[PDB]
Amino acid sequence: ELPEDPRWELPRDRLVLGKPLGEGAFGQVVLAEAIGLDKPNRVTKVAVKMLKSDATEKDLSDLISEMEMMKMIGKHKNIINLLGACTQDGPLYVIVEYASKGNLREYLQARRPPEEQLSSKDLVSCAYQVARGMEYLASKKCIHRDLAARNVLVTEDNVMKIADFGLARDIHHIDYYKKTTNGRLPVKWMAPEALFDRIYTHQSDVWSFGVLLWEIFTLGGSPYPGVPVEELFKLLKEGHRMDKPSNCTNELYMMMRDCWHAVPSQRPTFKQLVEDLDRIVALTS
Ligand SMILES: Cn1cc(-c2cnc3cnn(S(=O)(=O)c4cnc5ccc(Cl)nn45)c3c2)cn1
Numbered sequence: 619e620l621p622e623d624p625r626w627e628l629p630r631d632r633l634v635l636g637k638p639l640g641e642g643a644f645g646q647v648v649l650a651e652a653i654g655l656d657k658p659n660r661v662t663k664v665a666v667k668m669l670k671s672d673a674t675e676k677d678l679s680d681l682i683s684e685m686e687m688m689k690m691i692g693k694h695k696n697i698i699n700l701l702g703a704c705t706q707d708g709p710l711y712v713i714v715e716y717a718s719k720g721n722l723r724e725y726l727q728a729r730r731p732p733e734e735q736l737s738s739k740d741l742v743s744c745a746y747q748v749a750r751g752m753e754y755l756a757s758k759k760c761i762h763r764d765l766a767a768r769n770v771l772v773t774e775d776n777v778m779k780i781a782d783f784g785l786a787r788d789i790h791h792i793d794y795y796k797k798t799t800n801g802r803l804p805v806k807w808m809a810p811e812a813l814f815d816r817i818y819t820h821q822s823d824v825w826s827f828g829v830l831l832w833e834i835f836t837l838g839g840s841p842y843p844g845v846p847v848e849e850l851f852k853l854l855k856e857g858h859r860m861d862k863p864s865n866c867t868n869e870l871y872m873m874m875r876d877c878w879h880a881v882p883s884q885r886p887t888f889k890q891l892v893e894d895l896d897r898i899v900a901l902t903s
Pocket residue numbers: 639640641644647665667698714715716717718719720721768769770771781782
């Protein structure tokens with residue numbers, strides 16, 4: 619039913635399927651070992667995405683689109699890269715790079731003081747990598763639409779990788795009240811113009827990066843804790859802006875505030891942010 623693509627196909631018997639990964643939150647995803655991706659007698663830990671049992675024609679369409687998006691966008695150090703696929707004679711498998719330390723929010727929380735604590739340079743370095751991944755995605759004209767620490771994955775070598783940048787999402791079907799599996803409301807990462815007017819741009823992604831920065835320097839803090847949807851609307855209509863996190867230089871809080879500029883055109887680009895974080899890293903102890 620699915621067209622062959624020898625650029626990416628891997629025979630099913632090269633994939634030893636392992637434990638479920640996301641508890642279901644991010645689609646049907648399992649750890650797996652791939653024999654001879656590159657090198658034919660080496661195994662590589664990878665993550666594999668497939669369709670659930672009760673999956674519609676629309677569900678299959680979506681997974682294909684995401685795979686094809688990964689094909690077009692090309693490779694970068696700081697994004698989750700496509701590695702291969704099994705599309706013939708069985709269920710669609712999309713093989714992607716595996717991030718053994720989980721998402722950036724959990725990785726930060728697991729390293730709060732009362733597992734080793736992260737230095738100031740480590741935290742600014744985390745932000746630089748995430749902005750590098752976003753700079754690359756933007757240069758390829760990709761808009762994430764849901765950039766947050768929960769969608770940054772951390773590899774065994776502490777490499778930050780943006781995840782889920784290729785998902786198919788009908789923005790006019792978002793459940794504003796729907797909560798993450800952690801209990802937070804994704805609307806708290808959306809730029810006002812995206813939330814109120816359904817207008818998604820590279821500039822709204824930069825707003826979301828500002829919130830992500832706030833997550834880094836609170837070591838996994840929760841934005842607007844206790845604030846339900848309707849009151850978030852009020853706070854944004856009134857121009858509310860989160861407070862400076864403790865142990866956060868005034869410079870890095872100005873970056874946050876600059877990302878949260880009321881006027882989208884006045885926010886910095888990811889290209890700008892990368893240049894600035896690069897400089898700030900070189901100057902952090
Ligand atoms: C399609 N795709 C799947 C992975 C992938 C790679 N390595 C791991 C390790 N754990 N998990 S995870 O439990 O499912 C999880 C925890 N937080 C998140 C946020 C976003 C996503 Cl996609 N998954 N996730 C992984 C998922 C990359 N691309």
